[PDB]
């Protein structure tokens, strides 16, 4: 069973607990857990599949207003909402990505960096150039010998549970 697409009880109640976030630190930890729980293929749960995108927006909005209400311009410009130096984040995650020994190690680093630091956690400009530099490396690794592994072995590489294979 399901509810309407754009207005339903899940989104309502979630906006409820979202309104009550009252600090940058509370909101930061809220959005990082939420992203980790509900987004990507490595997401913890597909429970909110149909609603997490809208809800993420609402958190993003609440966090961002808190950022303008309580933080200084210098923090808006140079620090992630975790307290860290945004430049140091960019250096550290690019460095991690350049060291990944495999496309599967790369994809996890890239997915997590977005999960943790997507705006409004990192400053947008720092986020977009980091995202882009990671995408480069991830494509350079994934698109090497892209058809060499046969499909059967690729399924194992992904760690997929083959439920069915039409003959």
């Amino acid at each position: 069973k399901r509810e309407p697409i754009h207005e339903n009880s899940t989104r309502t109640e979630w906006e409820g607990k979202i309104a009550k976030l009252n600090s940058v630190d509370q909101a930061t930890k809220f959005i990082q857990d939420f992203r980790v729980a509900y987004s990507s293929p490595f997401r913890k749960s597909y429970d909110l599949d149909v609603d997490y995108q809208y809800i993420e927006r609402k958190i993003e909005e609440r966090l961002s207003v808190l950022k303008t209400e309580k933080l200084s311009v210098a923090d808006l410009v140079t620090k992630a909402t975790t307290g860290e130096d945004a430049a140091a984040v960019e250096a550290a995650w690019i460095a991690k990505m350049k060291a990944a020994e495999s496309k599967y190690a790369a994809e996890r680093i890239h997915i997590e960096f977005r999960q943790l630091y997507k705006p409004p956690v990192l400053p947008v400009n720092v986020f977009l150039r980091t995202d882009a530099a990671l995408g480069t490396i991830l494509m350079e690794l994934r698109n090497t010998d892209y058809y060499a592994t046969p499909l059967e072995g690729l399924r194992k590489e992904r760690g997929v549970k083959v439920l069915h294979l039409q003959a």
């Binding site: 697409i5 754009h6 987004s39 990507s40 995108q53 809208y54 993420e56 927006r57 993003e60 909005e61 961002s64 207003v65 303008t68 311009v73 808006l76 410009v77 994809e107 890239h110 997915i111 977005r114 997507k118 705006p119 409004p120 400053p123 947008v124 400009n125 986020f127 977009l128 150039r129 995202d131 990671l134 995408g135 991830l138 494509m139 994934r142």
Partner: protein, 339 residues
Amino acid sequence: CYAQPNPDWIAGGLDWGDWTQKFHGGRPSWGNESTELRTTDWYRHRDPARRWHAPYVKDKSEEARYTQRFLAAYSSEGSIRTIDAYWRDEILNKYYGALLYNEYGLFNAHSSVGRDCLSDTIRQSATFAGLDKVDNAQMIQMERLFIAKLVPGFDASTDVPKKIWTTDPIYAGARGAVEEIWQGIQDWNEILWAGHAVYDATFGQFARREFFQRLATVYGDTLTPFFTAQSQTYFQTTRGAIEDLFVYCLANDPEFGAHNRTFLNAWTEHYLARSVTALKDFVGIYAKVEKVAGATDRAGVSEALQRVFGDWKVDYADKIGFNIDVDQKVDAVLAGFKN
């Protein structure tokens, strides 16, 4: 007005679901991470000029055909004969050409804007804003190639103007401003706001209006005003749309206004400084200019600067609650007057 297939998790979107295909990593086709500003409706912007392709292209065509008729008649008149030769060879040919590089850089800042921004009318205004700027650049070069046809020995190659734009201190602060607005950020609201509403409305208006257009009108330059008239018209048309987007639609969003003003003020602070630098470097050009009493000296230059910053205060700064001391900004730039 409403073609972009935006979902409900982007303010204004009416579709549902995740995108059909994303970037490696997971970047969405379009997404809120593309800008620090927020709104209840990204589709609210309306160009105050109603510029869509058919009118936008129509108008530019008129100016294109008239420009050639005016050039054919101008060379026939011989009116290039009374141009002041120093202004023509030492200031116009060289430093008005270097400004083509400045306008070119502002046009290319729009490229990522046209990819990332979140509404069709903003994509439309952005593109015409950027097309006019490459127009500006091409038009300056058209002028130089025209003068080259009337004046033997006049070199309309871009080599010297490019060397001047890349190495000459007068334009170092400008070149720095443009290089940061173009290739140094990606927030598409920050590109548009810093480029048109701060940098271009102060330095750009000074260089085009206060220096080359104004000074051509005291050195008997009958040719260059025909060209700055187009850049100045394009500036005002673009200001119209920038104003609607950042003042009416964003800094007054019924829910995120104060939010958006915070980022707007921060931005304005950063790029007002960059603007002041560019000007202070740029005002050294008067060292190479023949003196004229109300224009080319400190009293006049101060008046010109008072117009840029004063106008900018009433047209942009006071609308977003940004505090500026025109007098201080004027002084900050005049420190570079070098006379």
